Design a protein around this ligand. Sequence first.
Ligand SMILES: [Zn+2]
Ligand SMILES: [Zn+2]
Ligand SMILES: [Zn+2]
Ligand SMILES: [Zn+2]
Ligand SMILES: [Zn+2]
Lengths: 332, 100, 212, 78, 105, 237, 237, 216, 81, 126
Amino acid sequence: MFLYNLTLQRATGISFAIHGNFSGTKQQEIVVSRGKILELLRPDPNTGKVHTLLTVEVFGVIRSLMAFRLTGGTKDYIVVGSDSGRIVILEYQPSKNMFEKIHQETFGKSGCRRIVPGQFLAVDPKGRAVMISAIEKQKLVYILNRDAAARLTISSPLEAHKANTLVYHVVGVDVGFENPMFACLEMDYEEADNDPTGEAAANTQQTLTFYELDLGLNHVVRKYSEPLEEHGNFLITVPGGSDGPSGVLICSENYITYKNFGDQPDIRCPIPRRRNDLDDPERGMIFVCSATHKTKSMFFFLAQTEQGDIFKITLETDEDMVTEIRLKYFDT
Amino acid sequence: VCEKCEKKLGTVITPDTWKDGARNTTESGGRKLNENKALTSKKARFDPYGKNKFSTCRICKSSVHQPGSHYCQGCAYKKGICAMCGKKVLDTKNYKQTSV
Amino acid sequence: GHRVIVSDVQESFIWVRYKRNENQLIIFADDTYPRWVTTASLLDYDTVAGADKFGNICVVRLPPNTNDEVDEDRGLLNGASQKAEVIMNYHVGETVLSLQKTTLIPGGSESLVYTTLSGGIGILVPFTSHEDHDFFQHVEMHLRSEHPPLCGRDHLSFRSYYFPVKNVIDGDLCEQFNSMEPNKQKNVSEELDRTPPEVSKKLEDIRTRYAF
Amino acid sequence: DATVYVGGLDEKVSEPLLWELFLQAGPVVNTHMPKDRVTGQHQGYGFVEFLSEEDADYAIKIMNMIKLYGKPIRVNKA
Amino acid sequence: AKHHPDLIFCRKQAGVAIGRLCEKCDGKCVICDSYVRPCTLVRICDECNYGSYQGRCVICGGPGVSDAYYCKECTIQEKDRDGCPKIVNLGSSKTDLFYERKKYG
Amino acid sequence: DKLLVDVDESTLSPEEQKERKIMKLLLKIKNGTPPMRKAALRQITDKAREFGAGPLFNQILPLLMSPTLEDQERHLLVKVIDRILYKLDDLVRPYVHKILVVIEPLLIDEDYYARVEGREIISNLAKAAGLATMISTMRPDIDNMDEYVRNTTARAFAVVASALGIPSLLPFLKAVCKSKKSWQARHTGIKIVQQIAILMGCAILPHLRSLVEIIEHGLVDEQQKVRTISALAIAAL
Amino acid sequence: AHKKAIRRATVNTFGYIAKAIGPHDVLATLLNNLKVQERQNRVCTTVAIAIVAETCSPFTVLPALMNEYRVPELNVQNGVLKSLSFLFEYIGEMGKDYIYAVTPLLEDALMDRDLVHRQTASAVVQHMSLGVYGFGCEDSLNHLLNYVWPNVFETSPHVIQAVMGALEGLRVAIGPCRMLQYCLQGLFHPARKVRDVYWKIYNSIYIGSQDALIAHYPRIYNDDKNTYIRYELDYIL
Amino acid sequence: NRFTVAELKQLVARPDVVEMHDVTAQDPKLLVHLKATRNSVPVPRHWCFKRKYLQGKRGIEKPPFELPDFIKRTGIQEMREALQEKEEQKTMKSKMREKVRPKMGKIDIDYQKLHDAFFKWQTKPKLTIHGDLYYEGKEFETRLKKKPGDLSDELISLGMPVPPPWLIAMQRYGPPPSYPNLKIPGLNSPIGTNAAEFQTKTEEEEIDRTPWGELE
Amino acid sequence: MTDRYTIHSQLEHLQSKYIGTGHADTTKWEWLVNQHRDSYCSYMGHFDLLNYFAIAENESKARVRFNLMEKMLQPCGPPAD
Amino acid sequence: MDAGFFRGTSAEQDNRFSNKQKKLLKQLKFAECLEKKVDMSKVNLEVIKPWITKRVTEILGFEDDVVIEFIFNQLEVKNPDSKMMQINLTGFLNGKNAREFMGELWPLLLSAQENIAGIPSAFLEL
Ligand SMILES: [Zn+2]
Ligand SMILES: [Zn+2]
Ligand SMILES: [Zn+2]
Ligand SMILES: [Zn+2]
Ligand SMILES: [Zn+2]
């Protein structure tokens, strides 16, 4: 009984979307991950209709996706972390209409392992490094560069490993042209597995830790580590350097928190709830996704809650630090 | 075989120890990376259905032992010729070839 | 008929026979693997196709000697005394919730259609000759090395995610022939002893006579 | 009773056949039907170990049913 | 090697350095030590090509003359993913051979 | 000499029969044919823990101190030591320093393979004894009056830092380079940093700013040997 | 010859010659050479039998090699097994054509009283297992697992590492699920002997295929204070 | 501190698997749970035996390996047998003299026959399903044990038209005590009414047996 | 005895490297906590297992992932000592 | 090759030896209070130093500035690990003196971080 497999209709659900200048021109595309398929979508500005330019089947589980620019670069690269145990860097070729693999670097065994990296993927906002990490105890930083023939070059991985430690999210921090920072929603389960009473599970707390890639000494150092009040579930990179302050917005259950390392005190805003809501009162509220709009003028975030409510988030800076978060109902 | 027929030769699986002029080393390209043995199986091997079927010598009618050969070793040695194409590789006017 | 195929949540398929004049339901066969079954469909009187939560399809057949004349201790391996043979494994990649054996076009042949949770629709079509089966197997084995998956994964390893791949040729990989570069299409098609139009035509004929 | 002694047999009869003979009544778990080495032939008497008592009690009755080569066969407890 | 139980691999996180093999080791697999069917190229960790050591043999440590590969079977079993396969200790066999020849010669 | 006189085994104590047994095995390892040598080697490895770390070392160590060894006999004896070092991994702590003064000379041996096998046995000894035992044992040898002991102790700390890692003994090493009673100890600490950089190579980079700050105060020292070794340590780093 | 390069050039030359005078004249000579006592001769003759077998396709040299297994001499029988091991390593995917031929030979060898006969047959299973990966030959391989598996309680290291290699080859050919189904009953067995051998098979399956085992673990029930059911998989849509 | 076998057997869901030594386990509940799970194969039985595996007196007399049939069809065994039967007669002089003057074309089987042995006549052997572990006595204890109501052709010795001769007495003497549920015609089974066999006929009419997806 | 201790050092070396290998003295609790945590990671990784769980419970996927991450701390209750 | 390549194996590479630091964290008996976490930014160090100097000097029977400065260097990190400090001192002191020594130095640092000034209670008194 020999069978042949064919696909009539490809998958249409969307796991990831990144937007960038992938074609290398003025036009903006979206690169969507449909789990097992990678597609390139270009939406028409005047007509308004979305067009599918490319659709390639990758035979793997795409677990994370990011877009990446080199310093002073026009075209964007696609960095894919998957279950393959390797990290690939892809470039869209418009003359050929195909993705082109530029780099493929191998670090681990394949499958969706617990300690092999691939789950979280964060890029440095200037484009000097990329950081791939597993759910727990395994992170790896790759340094990206350009040679004299304008080709992408990759280095050996720098590793940051911390045993017994869970990662909820990892995002790259916008420090201007200083040493690249990466922020994390870590948790340490070491104490909790040694308390028979179960108290240590109850009162262990999530921390935000900052890893700094010291480009001078070629190694990654775990700088700052600060406990959070409640458990966040993801992070937002606040645009920094010349434009805006450099910090992280932590989204947690019923709260949005601005934090930065330094003298800045933490700033918390409750999330607005719907008036006269029919839900169960015990249920909290989280944010499920966000997006940043950076103009040259100013910037805001659009974050959506579980119920579908999109809020604008705007930061108010009193000189160097930020003083309050402002939060405005945008739509549903 | 003669010099044009040596692309029709089979190779030994292990690489040659004298690397120069080898056909089965990595550098020569005759030992390729990620070989699928099922795809390259019928190359330079006998295939009764395929292109190299079990042949016999055109002269003595006894079976050859090399794929794509039209002349058995003894007849090719004695006439001085390539076992595959039959072009002569040796001038045997002054050689009393001895099969012993 | 009087055969019942029960899908356990994790114990896979069980074959039960209902005998009228005793009024009883008797387990006569089952499977040797744990399987998280989501759906099933009967291919013939002896074969069952199934799908898991983990994203793979299997085809389990019942061996030719088995009789369902069992009258109700021993058992093999803490189970039924007769075991069913797994004759196909295939990891789709996405959770299948619906298998159905049908004909899709008028004047086509039958196929096994499955619809994944993610929104995909595929078919599993049986080869009718060995010459087709050898052609498509060779096209697949060339393309696994010439045109490897774009994210660094191995294709034979991908389709063998939980159980080794059995008796299936991936046609999604094979129809990426037409996306290769022309020197590579010519190089692959040399060893099949065909020109790249002929390879595209044979890839397009099987899709045409089963599907869309 | 688990075992029985069986007399009066013809050497064409075999232990495998004997097992099928008495499992007609109830299964012979352990069969013993001597092969004599010296002249390579059977004297024709048997010993049978069963699962439990059940096989043994039936045993004597099973003797009446038995009839090998037109002849009877002794079955008694042991 | 598979023939010496006391030898020990580096196993650090491999990098962009390509591992090489000396004339004696040419054509064999670094892990299972076979001569046939080369599948993938060997990468060594940064420390193992530091400095003067850049370009020496992976398996023994002599002047390297060609690139090292993993075989097909070590690829299928994913033995190529364990780390830097540079051997970091000489072991008993190499040391014994030296003292034996030196005693004689 | 105890093998010359003949004596019934039953007459003497279990300790004395144990040490006579070890003495026979060591004779077969030193002077035997390769069959005798193989069997005796195997048996002293398997029965090592049963013998105890004490009775082995107080007969192995006098043999390595002898003025008439050949280098193949020295090699066979230190092969015995590192075979039994896997066995009694935690029972070698009272014998750490005794092993070092019989093995640290091999770190400056003119023969390359002696130098490597001296390194491997000091790194195995460090992994067997652990940092604290090693630190306490080698503390006295930093300010010793002979420059031979100080030389080879500075060589051996480099090896112990390779095995256990630089962050382990970086506080101790900083404490030994600051010490302003003795310049011998300051010289020795800076020599350890030089040797770590020669040995570790690329590995020292994640600690480079910790290492330079230990050495910076030595460039301006009043003692000229210390200034020289600080410049040499900077060059190594 | 003592130098290994001379030996591997020699083995290659046998395949080239067999392309000219045919595999039978070559093969009879090589099969006669297996009666020799010294192992270096026999191991190389074994490799040369596989070389010719590969270059002149295995249906030519198979019958005579399988016939030589009946010769009542131990080294000849170990020799034929050894050259089948090399043969399956060399032919790779093409070895799905002869696995049914040599399955009964190997199950005869795995029932054998000599331990070596069992270690060479396990090497053959390892290499034959990885060749037919992806080709639906799992019934032969599962049959041979039934013979390989009782040898897990052997203690000799050569035999013990050949068995483990065979099981690691079988994991990639018949799947992690079968290999976990074999281990399951002895992971918590009362004797440490059965237990640690079983645990070191489990670790090999776990390392190589950690992700695939999620679907294959058994259901453990809840006890009084700890919950052990994975309730998500029990979800019904 | 530890369970005896009776409490353990009642505490299992399935008490047939528990053995004498399972109580000595460090976690006996999980052990007997795992022994009663489906499709797992038991620990090889010789783990507790003092004699080494396969080192037993019966194994001394094992016969030589036999080739399969499709290989004996090639005639390799007769040729190579004759060959090595000549080569024991030769002296060392003669063997070393035909090593300088060799003899070609001696033991040659045509290629087409050898190809056909491997690519036409190959048969799959008898294989064993998963969990069927080999143990030492296995190939002799492979006779097994055939149930009442099922007869062998040879048990010809009866020579009776088709019911059993013994039954004419089992109805007399009674149903045997050893079998509680056994059913035989005339006593408690139809030769009431006999519609049981008609059911199988009707169902057998109902079935289509056409395997899906096979080769044409 | 020494072979017991060398097996012990080797297996604790493995367990530090790959979290979740056992040895001869793995308790039930340890083995099951490992396979719970590996399961959670696997669910997070595969997109359609996570879809299935987000449909069967009427939750959004972000809530599902966040609850699975919360369960990773004590997946099977407190340690049994 | 400027040194040899071969320098011994590290403890991350070599499985033949067990982790002696973890093993000692199991079997040494540590003092009662060392689990309380210390922040050294909240502690004033140079006031703590003369007591340590004096304490080590009388335990030792002489003065060892390497042991002194070693103890001080371990207290420079933000969260000092107390159990490792008792282990690392056990070689120099008795191992019974090390336990007592941590048993008085550690609550003293706790008292210092509870203060606003950085100074522990017994030193505010005197
Ligand atoms: Zn001719
Ligand atoms: Zn020619
Ligand atoms: Zn080399
Ligand atoms: Zn290999
Ligand atoms: Zn390395």
